Amino acid sequence: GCCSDPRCAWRC
């Protein structure tokens, strides 16, 4: 899930 990617950590 996106939250592992710090470039996808937003809202996560």
Side-chain angles (χ1 to χ4, degrees):
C2 242
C3 314
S4 287
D5 172 20
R7 227 183 288 153
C8 213
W10 78 295
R11 303 296 191 102
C12 226

